Amino acid sequence: MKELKYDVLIIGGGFAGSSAAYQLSRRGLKILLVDSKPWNRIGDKPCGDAVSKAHFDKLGMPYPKGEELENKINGIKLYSPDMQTVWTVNGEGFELNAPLYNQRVLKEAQDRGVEIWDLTTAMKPIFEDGYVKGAVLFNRRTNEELTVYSKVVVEATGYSRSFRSKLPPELPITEDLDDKDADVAYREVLLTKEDIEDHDYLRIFIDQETSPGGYWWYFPKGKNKVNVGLGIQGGMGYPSIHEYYKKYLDKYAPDVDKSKLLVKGGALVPTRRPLYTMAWNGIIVIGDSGFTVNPVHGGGKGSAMISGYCAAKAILSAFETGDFSASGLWDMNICYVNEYGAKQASLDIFRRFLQKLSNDDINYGMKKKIIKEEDLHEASEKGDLHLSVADKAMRVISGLGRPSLLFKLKAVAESMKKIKELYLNYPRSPSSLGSWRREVDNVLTEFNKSLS
Numbered sequence: 261m262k263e264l265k266y267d268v269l270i271i272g273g274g275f276a277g278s279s280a281a282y283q284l285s286r287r288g289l290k291i292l293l294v295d296s297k298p299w300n301r302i303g304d305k306p307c308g309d310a311v312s313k314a315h316f317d318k319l320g321m322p323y324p325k326g327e328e329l330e331n332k333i334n335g336i337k338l339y340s341p342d343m344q345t346v347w348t349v350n351g352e353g354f355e356l357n358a359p360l361y362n363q364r365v366l367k368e369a370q371d372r373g374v375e376i377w378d379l380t381t382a383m384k385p386i387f388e389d390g391y392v393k394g395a396v397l398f399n400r401r402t403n404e405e406l407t408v409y410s411k412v413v414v415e416a417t418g419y420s421r422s423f424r425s426k427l428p429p430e431l432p433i434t435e436d437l438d439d440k441d442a443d444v445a446y447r448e449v450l451l452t453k454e455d456i457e458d459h460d461y462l463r464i465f466i467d468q469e470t471s472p473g474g475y476w477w478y479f480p481k482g483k484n485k486v487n488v489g490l491g492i493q494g495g496m497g498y499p500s501i502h503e504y505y506k507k508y509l510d511k512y513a514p515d516v517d518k519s520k521l522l523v524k525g526g527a528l529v530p531t532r533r534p535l536y537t538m539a540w541n542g543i544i545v546i547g548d549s550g551f552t553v554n555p556v557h558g559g560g561k562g563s564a565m566i567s568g569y570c571a572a573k574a575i576l577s578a579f580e581t582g583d584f585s586a587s588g589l590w591d592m593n594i595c596y597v598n599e600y601g602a603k604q605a606s607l608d609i610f611r612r613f614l615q616k617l618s619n620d621d622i623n624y625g626m627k628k629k630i631i632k633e634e635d636l637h638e639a640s641e642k643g644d645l646h647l648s649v650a651d652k653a654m655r656v657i658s659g660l661g662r663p664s665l666l667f668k669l670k671a672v673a674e675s676m677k678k679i680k681e682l683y684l685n686y687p688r689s690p691s692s693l694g695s696w697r698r699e700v701d702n703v704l705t706e707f708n709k710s711l712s
């Protein structure tokens with residue numbers, strides 16, 4: 261078959277892949293990005309389509325404008341299980357037309373020298389001499405089966421992790437996902453009968469009975485259009501998520517016009533710390549494939565762009581040292597862990613705590629205000645549950661006279677702090693990875709026991 265040579269092959273054109281291509285463009289490298297979907301459908305994976313504005317600023321990512329921005333967001337309303345307590349968290353964000361913005365990032369990258377092949381699937385990994393050296397591609401637009409050699413492969417295939425799962429299991433880059441370390445999520449976009457009240461605010465409903473292990477949401481895409489859905493924890497033996505959706509939709513969205521359904525669908529959502537290493541010999545993994553999703557609120561589009569940024573930086577470093585080993589690409593880990601990874605690890609622990617709380621716990625915690633918005637902002641943005649904040653919450657929890665998991669909040673905060681420092685001390689070289697990973701596992705397995 262025909263053979264082509266590129267500096268970098270990016271597999272997947274989602275938020276992760278497109279950002280990597282964008283950040284790498286116009287810097288002396290010959291880059292190819294491929295995606296199985298047609299151009300017009302790239303980026304249309306079921307999503308809430310809510311992304312913080314801060315991510316676009318930090319990474320120098322172009323703001324979503326025109327038809328790419330459906331609704332401006334100025335905050336989030338958080339509802340208690342009994343709907344009695346409502347927390348308001350202010351902050352600027354965007355409700356996106358995800359495919360439209362995704363395709364512009366691709367189009368701009370293409371205008372900057374990046375070659376993009378749609379309707380192209382990476383079938384077989386080229387793994388020779390202990391290295392990832394490219395992939396076999398099938399372009400069904402031209403019915404060609406091409407062999408493409410690259411110095412670095414950027415695996416950005418989303419939750420399917422379809423490419424790296426075909427690599428030898430001895431590679432640390434083939435680390436798989438535990439069922440309980442993920443959520444299944446489902447959403448629909450419908451027009452509403454009445455205009456949406458406070459349509460510039462997202463709505464999140466916490467309820468372990470209507471959405472166990474996750475939450476319900478109501479994300480306005482306009483004055484009369486809303487992205488409504490839910491997420492539940494996988495590996496728990498829960499019935500189909502659509503059973504939950506169909507049963508409790510009217511409670512969280514009584515205003516929707518069910519005859520005006522625009523889109524519907526669901527997918528898997530990783531909810532844990534990222535891959536212990538997101539780089540190895542000749543390969544970097546980003547996005548959902550590298551588990552870059554926020555373990556608490558399930559947001560992954562912002563951190564996917566971050567992973568693409570770090571992938572670009574690491575690859576440039578590799579070419580400047582002529583070293584495409586794990587060691588040569590190791591800055592990928594250092595960059596991402598400091599930018600978002602260390603936060604994920606802390607929130608990974610906090611998630612396990614939150615998912616085991618009862619509705620009574622959450623009702624009590626919110627009504628009695630165990631934490632304030634100043635620290636809630638600090639919590640899900642820096643991953644830090646300050647010990648002073650936990651102490652203040654524990655003094656309130658001490659007023660509870662019934663048995664509750666809430667009483668372990670101080671211990672949870674200490675565990676979050678411990679694993680946070682452990683990730684900030686990420687191994688400088690691949691030779692220290694195994695020792696560090698086992699130390700992380702010990703912290704996690706210990707914490708799981710402490711919740712019982």
Ligand SMILES: Cc1cc2c(cc1C)N(C[C@H](O)[C@H](O)[C@H](O)COP(=O)(O)OP(=O)(O)OC[C@H]1O[C@@H](n3cnc4c(N)ncnc43)[C@H](O)[C@@H]1O)c1[nH]c(=O)[nH]c(=O)c1N2
Nearest residue numbers: 272274275276295296307308309310382418547548560561
């Ligand atoms: C229902 C629901 C709701 C939400 C969310 C998820 C879900 C399922 N998330 C998470 C968010 O959707 C997700 O984390 C990111 O879109 C991940 O971006 P990626 O580019 O990694 O994956 P993504 O799946 O978007 O990209 C993968 C791409 O690779 C392609 N591909 C796969 N295998 C291939 C192969 N072998 N060859 C070629 N191409 C291949 C696919 O075709 C696809 O285009 C979210 N996030 C957030 O921040 N805000 C929110 O509101 C939500 N809400």
Ligand SMILES: CC(C)=CCC/C(C)=C/CC/C(C)=C/CC/C(C)=C/COP(=O)(O)OP(=O)(O)O
Nearest residue numbers: 308310311312314350351352353354557558559
């Ligand atoms: C539904 C699933 C699976 C995930 C959703 C993920 C979420 C909640 C995304 C919300 C993103 C968004 C639009 C946030 C806007 C509201 C907000 C509190 C933003 C905070 O970000 P910053 O702008 O940095 O906050 P500051 O106000 O401190 O600057």
